[PDB]
Assembly symmetry: C3
Homo-oligomer: 81 residues x 3
């Protein structure tokens, strides 16, 4: 009777020790994780694709401008010839 209880107690203590070691490992893993309060999401930041689209709009306007200037410089060269 006592022997059976003692055996169950030994198994219980082993399970508890194992749990305590799992919890220690979990605490270490948690500390490797980023906080919600810090990490940027779609609510805070643009994606690469979103930035690329905005930059592309600018770049087309730059190229159009350069093209207009090149034409202007040729016009001036014709006037002064």
């Amino acid at each position: 009777g006592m022997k059976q209880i003692e055996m169950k107690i030994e198994e219980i203590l082993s399970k508890i020790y194992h749990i305590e070691n799992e919890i220690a490992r979990i605490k270490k893993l948690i500390n490797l994780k980023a906080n919600k309060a810090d990490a940027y999401t779609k609510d805070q930041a643009y994606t690469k694709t979103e930035i690329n689209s905005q930059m592309k709009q600018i770049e087309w306007k730059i190229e159009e401008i350069l093209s207009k200037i090149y034409h202007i410089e040729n016009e001036i060269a014709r006037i002064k010839k």
Copy 2:
């Protein structure tokens, strides 16, 4: 006396099983969390507000340029007439 100890042991074993199931769930949840080593924060990235401020300044410069170019093209047109 032995009956009461056995009952407590049953309760302990149930509690342990419950705890083990919670830990298993916890481990799976942790694995769905982003790592500090990967997640971008204010130290790594601009916000949408920061980007928007920079893009609006560029657009203002572009708007200034386009006014100057239109003016020039009209000046040239007058010289050639």
Copy 3:
């Protein structure tokens, strides 16, 4: 004999109560962590440095353009004098 078993059961119940409190804490910590499904990383977003480089490239072009426009305006003022 039965007294000593009762004391080991008391120590086990104390350990379990402590563990339950650790688990409750762990769950609270996990809920403060950002999800992989939400957090932006290098796979979703540019860094400040990467944006700065792109913005510097645009700024150079704007500078080139402003210089060309200033030159052209001076050339036109001379032609019309």
